Amino acid sequence: MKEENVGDFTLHYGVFEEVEPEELRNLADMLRQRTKKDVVFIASRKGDKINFVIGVSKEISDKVNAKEVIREVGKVLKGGGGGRADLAQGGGKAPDKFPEAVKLLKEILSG
């Protein structure tokens, strides 16, 4: 996975093959504990399905609401999502659309 600063945030993102959803969630959780400005968008492709997670540093939960953002990237990935402002997760039907979801998230983070 990659790291890129976007606006006042640090975005960590990547899509993995064959990672279990609960493992993916735990990884995202760990990665957003790093700093106070982390946004983590990671996904796991299992064949023609994709599971994805958004985790943010707790300090920026109001700024980047994972509840809202998960649904926005979820739409691109032909899926849904839900959770809390600091950590949310979903499943979708369009694994090949991850790059497009990442582009959207960067646009969201920049405003």
Curated annotation (Swiss-Prot):
Top-rank taxon: Bacteria
Parts forming coiled coils: none
Q: Where does the UniProt annotation locate this protein?
A: Cytoplasm
According to the UniProt entry, the note on domains is: Consists of three domains; the N-terminal catalytic domain, the editing domain and the C-terminal C-Ala domain. The editing domain removes incorrectly charged amino acids, while the C-Ala domain, along with tRNA(Ala), serves as a bridge to cooperatively bring together the editing and aminoacylation centers thus stimulating deacylation of misacylated tRNAs. The Aquifex aeolicus domain can be used in vitro to replace the corresponding domain in E.coli.
The record describes the protein's role as:
Catalyzes the attachment of alanine to tRNA(Ala) in a two-step reaction: alanine is first activated by ATP to form Ala-AMP and then transferred to the acceptor end of tRNA(Ala). Also edits incorrectly charged Ser-tRNA(Ala) and Gly-tRNA(Ala) via its editing domain.
- What family is this? Belongs to the class-II aminoacyl-tRNA synthetase family.
Question: What is the name of this protein?
Answer: Alanine--tRNA ligase
Its ancestry begins with:
Bacteria, Pseudomonadati, Aquificota, Aquificia, Aquificales
Which part of the entire sequence is included in the shown chain? 758 to 867 of 867
